[PDB]
Design a protein around this ligand. Structure first.
Ligand code: 7ZK
Length: 126
Protein backbone atom coordinates (compact mmCIF):
# COMPACT_ATOMS: atom_id res chain seq x y z
CA UNK A 1 0.00 0.00 0.00
CA UNK A 2 0.85 3.70 -0.06
CA UNK A 3 2.09 5.64 2.93
CA UNK A 4 -0.64 7.59 4.73
CA UNK A 5 -0.32 11.36 4.74
CA UNK A 6 1.69 12.65 7.71
CA UNK A 7 -0.13 14.04 10.75
CA UNK A 8 -1.49 17.56 10.55
CA UNK A 9 1.20 20.08 11.42
CA UNK A 10 -0.60 23.38 10.76
CA UNK A 11 -4.12 24.65 11.43
CA UNK A 12 -5.18 28.29 10.93
CA UNK A 13 -8.41 27.57 12.85
CA UNK A 14 -6.50 27.02 16.11
CA UNK A 15 -5.34 29.88 18.36
CA UNK A 16 -1.61 30.40 18.81
CA UNK A 17 0.58 31.32 21.78
CA UNK A 18 4.20 31.10 22.95
CA UNK A 19 5.36 30.13 26.45
CA UNK A 20 8.57 29.47 28.34
CA UNK A 21 7.70 25.75 28.14
CA UNK A 22 6.92 25.59 24.42
CA UNK A 23 10.16 27.29 23.37
CA UNK A 24 12.03 25.02 25.80
CA UNK A 25 10.37 22.00 24.17
CA UNK A 26 11.65 23.10 20.75
CA UNK A 27 14.97 24.68 21.77
CA UNK A 28 16.13 22.17 24.40
CA UNK A 29 14.07 18.98 24.13
CA UNK A 30 13.49 18.57 20.39
CA UNK A 31 16.97 19.80 19.45
CA UNK A 32 18.81 17.55 21.93
CA UNK A 33 16.82 14.48 20.86
CA UNK A 34 17.28 15.32 17.18
CA UNK A 35 21.08 15.41 17.56
CA UNK A 36 21.25 12.13 19.51
CA UNK A 37 23.13 9.32 17.78
CA UNK A 38 20.02 7.09 17.82
CA UNK A 39 17.61 9.71 16.49
CA UNK A 40 17.58 8.87 12.78
CA UNK A 41 14.71 6.29 12.73
CA UNK A 42 12.52 8.83 14.56
CA UNK A 43 13.18 11.99 12.50
CA UNK A 44 10.35 11.43 9.99
CA UNK A 45 7.17 9.38 9.51
CA UNK A 46 7.89 5.67 9.19
CA UNK A 47 8.36 5.05 5.46
CA UNK A 48 6.53 1.74 5.34
CA UNK A 49 6.96 1.37 1.58
CA UNK A 50 10.72 2.01 1.64
CA UNK A 51 11.17 -0.33 4.62
CA UNK A 52 8.73 -2.96 3.26
CA UNK A 53 6.53 -2.88 6.39
CA UNK A 54 3.01 -3.41 4.98
CA UNK A 55 1.69 -4.03 8.51
CA UNK A 56 2.98 -0.86 10.20
CA UNK A 57 -0.01 1.37 9.49
CA UNK A 58 -2.41 -1.49 10.11
CA UNK A 59 -0.90 -1.72 13.61
CA UNK A 60 -0.03 1.94 14.29
CA UNK A 61 -3.19 4.04 14.00
CA UNK A 62 -1.83 7.19 15.71
CA UNK A 63 1.48 7.74 13.90
CA UNK A 64 3.90 10.30 15.29
CA UNK A 65 7.57 11.20 14.82
CA UNK A 66 10.04 13.94 15.69
CA UNK A 67 9.79 15.54 12.24
CA UNK A 68 6.07 16.08 12.78
CA UNK A 69 6.70 17.29 16.35
CA UNK A 70 9.29 19.79 15.10
CA UNK A 71 6.81 21.13 12.53
CA UNK A 72 3.99 21.35 15.08
CA UNK A 73 6.22 23.38 17.41
CA UNK A 74 7.35 25.61 14.53
CA UNK A 75 3.76 26.31 13.40
CA UNK A 76 2.49 26.96 16.96
CA UNK A 77 0.19 23.97 16.58
CA UNK A 78 0.32 23.24 20.33
CA UNK A 79 -1.46 25.47 22.83
CA UNK A 80 -0.26 23.57 25.92
CA UNK A 81 3.08 21.91 26.56
CA UNK A 82 1.27 18.70 27.54
CA UNK A 83 0.12 18.31 23.94
CA UNK A 84 3.73 18.20 22.77
CA UNK A 85 4.76 15.84 25.58
CA UNK A 86 1.90 13.52 24.61
CA UNK A 87 3.16 13.44 21.02
CA UNK A 88 6.65 12.42 22.17
CA UNK A 89 5.11 9.68 24.32
CA UNK A 90 2.96 8.53 21.40
CA UNK A 91 6.13 8.28 19.29
CA UNK A 92 7.97 6.09 21.79
CA UNK A 93 4.98 3.86 22.48
CA UNK A 94 4.44 3.39 18.74
CA UNK A 95 7.95 1.93 18.51
CA UNK A 96 7.32 -0.35 21.51
CA UNK A 97 3.94 -1.44 20.10
CA UNK A 98 5.25 -2.37 16.65
CA UNK A 99 8.36 -4.12 17.95
CA UNK A 100 9.15 -6.56 20.73
CA UNK A 101 11.11 -6.12 23.98
CA UNK A 102 14.84 -6.29 23.41
CA UNK A 103 14.78 -5.58 19.68
CA UNK A 104 17.71 -3.34 18.77
CA UNK A 105 15.33 -0.61 17.59
CA UNK A 106 13.58 -0.72 20.99
CA UNK A 107 16.90 -0.21 22.80
CA UNK A 108 17.32 2.89 20.62
CA UNK A 109 13.90 4.30 21.54
CA UNK A 110 14.46 3.55 25.23
CA UNK A 111 17.70 5.55 25.30
CA UNK A 112 15.94 8.50 23.65
CA UNK A 113 12.97 8.20 25.99
CA UNK A 114 15.28 8.15 29.02
CA UNK A 115 16.91 11.37 27.80
CA UNK A 116 13.47 12.82 27.00
CA UNK A 117 12.18 12.08 30.50
CA UNK A 118 15.30 13.63 32.02
CA UNK A 119 14.69 16.83 30.06
CA UNK A 120 10.98 16.92 30.92
CA UNK A 121 11.82 16.42 34.61
CA UNK A 122 13.58 19.80 34.22
CA UNK A 123 10.77 21.63 32.43
CA UNK A 124 10.54 25.30 33.46
CA UNK A 125 7.57 26.66 35.36
CA UNK A 126 5.15 28.70 33.25
C1 7ZK B 1 17.55 -0.75 13.85
C2 7ZK B 1 17.05 -0.57 12.41
C3 7ZK B 1 17.00 -1.65 11.55
C4 7ZK B 1 16.53 -1.48 10.23
C5 7ZK B 1 16.48 -2.65 9.27
C6 7ZK B 1 16.12 -0.25 9.81
C7 7ZK B 1 16.16 0.85 10.68
O1 7ZK B 1 15.73 2.15 10.22
C8 7ZK B 1 14.36 2.38 10.55
N1 7ZK B 1 13.76 3.48 10.07
C9 7ZK B 1 12.48 3.75 10.36
C10 7ZK B 1 11.76 2.87 11.15
C11 7ZK B 1 12.42 1.72 11.66
C12 7ZK B 1 11.69 0.69 12.58
C13 7ZK B 1 10.75 0.93 13.59
C14 7ZK B 1 10.14 2.28 14.05
C15 7ZK B 1 8.81 2.26 14.51
C16 7ZK B 1 8.20 3.47 14.93
C17 7ZK B 1 8.93 4.63 14.88
I1 7ZK B 1 8.00 6.42 15.50
C18 7ZK B 1 10.26 4.66 14.42
C19 7ZK B 1 10.86 3.45 14.01
N2 7ZK B 1 10.42 -0.24 14.10
C20 7ZK B 1 11.12 -1.17 13.48
N3 7ZK B 1 11.89 -0.62 12.56
C21 7ZK B 1 12.80 -1.36 11.69
C22 7ZK B 1 12.08 -2.04 10.59
C23 7ZK B 1 12.35 -3.34 10.74
N4 7ZK B 1 12.69 -3.51 12.29
C24 7ZK B 1 13.27 -4.54 12.50
C25 7ZK B 1 12.47 -5.43 13.51
N5 7ZK B 1 12.56 -4.89 14.88
C26 7ZK B 1 13.44 -2.54 12.53
N6 7ZK B 1 13.70 1.53 11.33
C27 7ZK B 1 16.62 0.68 11.99
Amino acid sequence: SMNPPPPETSNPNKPKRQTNQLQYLLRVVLKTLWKHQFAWPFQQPVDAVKLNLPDYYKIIKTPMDMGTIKKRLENNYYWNAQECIQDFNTMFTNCYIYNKPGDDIVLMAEALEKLFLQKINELPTE
